């Protein structure tokens, strides 16, 4: 019971996502459901972002501010989602979702 993270984070199930940035860099609409196989099953994501950009207030925790500048930034990963673009071309695309909180280092 002595472990501590350089940055804190929260995970949550995101159930009403309707917009996202795909692997190409476009804004696409995330559909609310996957109808086929005739269920139909709703489409939701397990997300995890940063609680805030600074746990301590020099940047991230545990850092050597004596020679480093930090910040806790949410990082993203790609996940396939059923989407549409301008209400057309409905299909599976790789979209960016917040997947973790990570410490960014900068020199001085």
């Amino acid at each position: 019971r002595g472990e501590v993270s350089v940055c804190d984070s929260e995970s949550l199930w995101v159930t009403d996502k309707s917009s996202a940035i795909d692997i190409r860099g476009h804004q696409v609409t995330v559909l609310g459901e996957i109808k086929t196989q005739n269920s139909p099953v709703k489409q939701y994501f397990y997300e995890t972002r940063c609680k805030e950009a600074r746990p301590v207030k020099n940047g991230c925790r545990g850092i050597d501010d004596k020679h480093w500048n930090s910040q806790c930034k949410t990082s993203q990963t790609y996940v396939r989602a059923l989407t549409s673009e301008n209400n057309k071309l409905v299909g599976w695309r790789w979209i960016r979702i917040d997947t973790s909180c990570v410490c960014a280092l900068s020199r001085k």
Binding site: G2, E3, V4, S5, V6, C7, I34, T36, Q37, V41, Y46, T48, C60, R61, G62, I63, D64, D65, K66, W68, S70, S75, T77, Y78, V79, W92, W94, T99, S100, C101, V102, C103, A104, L105, S106, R107
Partner: protein, 109 residues
């Protein structure tokens, strides 16, 4: 520019390379290679990120106040939906765990 506290590498991993996975329930599940969609089939694959085993950060994280701290990069996982089949041979969409990050953990020295 910036620099990560922990060195990571990403990779596209197909269900074919993967085979099995653990769901949000603890169960080992087989990940199906292709999923039936409207037109035809869809090869099932994942984008995974993990601590780079041959990165600079293999013994402790970068930028750590080594005075008060011990540190370490570790791969953390996330839940992605996948068409899978369980032990009782049932096919369905389930959340399985996949590596999505490499984060730094500290322990007070």
């Amino acid at each position: 520019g910036q620099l990560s506290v922990c060195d990571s590498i990403s990779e596209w991993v197909t269900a074919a390379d993967k085979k099995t996975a653990v769901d949000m329930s603890g169960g080992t599940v087989t990940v199906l290679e292709k999923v039936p969609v409207s037109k035809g089939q869809l090869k099932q694959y994942f984008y995974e990120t993990k601590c780079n085993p041959m990165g600079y950060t293999k013994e402790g994280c970068r930028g750590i106040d080594k005075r008060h701290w011990n540190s370490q990069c570790r791969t953390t996982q996330s839940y992605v939906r996948a068409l899978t089949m369980d032990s009782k041979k049932r096919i369905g969409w389930r959340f399985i765990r996949i590596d999505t990050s490499c984060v730094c953990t500290l322990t007070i020295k």
